Design a protein around this ligand. Structure first.
Ligand SMILES: OC[C@H]1O[C@H](O[C@H]2O[C@H](CO)[C@@H](O)[C@H](O)[C@H]2O)[C@H](O)[C@@H](O)[C@@H]1O
Lengths: 142, 142
């Protein structure tokens, strides 16, 4: 389907949730949040994707870790907007749904900002990951 | 139907291309481009909408007019996103298709920017118009 540009840097390893997303619409958002967002993990239908970020606990060598933030989406709720601050890594992620606006993951919002609107709801994410979220791309439903 | 939020201000007159878009998929983008985008007029199949913007030549007493820009879409080419900078009016529009990123209409990109994904390709637009493009909504195919 249609996707956004890649937002982020060249580090890490590529991931793409296209296949796991075929299990269903996003039902849950999980992130690890401190002054930056350190991982993202979505659930597609009943099927969690991988933890994309915070590859192992020794990543504390290079960044704060943060706390786990879970937002369960209700039936018929979908993400219509992503505000992402980023440079060589994703710094922060603020999601809005057709039902409500979620708190930003990442308290610092100092990097360049981009707002991506997804009519009909975000289908899935791809990007690059390691100790952090090197980059994100947003994929619509067709 | 899947459609983006309305991007713009409350001035002008509402337009909606729903009916004229029954004439077919979008085959051409026509705009008027200066420091800002001053009208848009898409072609559906062989049939154009009315000109949405630059209502009359006295509009030069409020803003610059600009030059006609035409992008012909190849068959099977469809519009997949738009970067829109906007405030009281639409300032600039940068259309992207499944085949290429097109030139910006509107050299100034200084107001609020958003990247609208248009899942499945752009079906038609609606919005508000007058001397300028007061605002736009993008209607997606799926
Ligand atoms: O622990 C190994 C390395 O961890 C960091 O680098 C990784 O994580 C980054 C953010 O996800 C990626 O950009 C990078 O490509 C990964 O290797 C850290 O920056 C390095 O110093 C460590 O060697």
């Amino acid at each position: 389907q249609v996707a956004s540009e890649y937002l982020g840097g060249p580090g890490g390893d590529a991931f793409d949730d296209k296949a796991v997303a075929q299990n269903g619409d996003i039902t849950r958002i999980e992130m690890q949040c401190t002054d930056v967002a350190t991982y993202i993990k979505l659930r597609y239908g009943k099927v969690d994707s991988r933890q994309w970020g915070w590859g192992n606990e020794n990543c504390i060598q290079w960044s704060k870790k943060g706390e786990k933030v879970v937002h369960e989406l209700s039936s018929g709720e979908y993400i219509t907007s992503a505000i992402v601050t980023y440079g060589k890594y994703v710094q922060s992620i603020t999601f809005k749904t057709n039902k409500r606006t979620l708190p930003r993951c990442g308290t610092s919002a100092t990097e360049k900002s981009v707002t991506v609107l997804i009519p009909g709801g975000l289908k899935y994410i791809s990007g690059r990951w390691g100790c952090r979220i090197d980059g994100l791309r947003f994929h619509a439903k067709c």
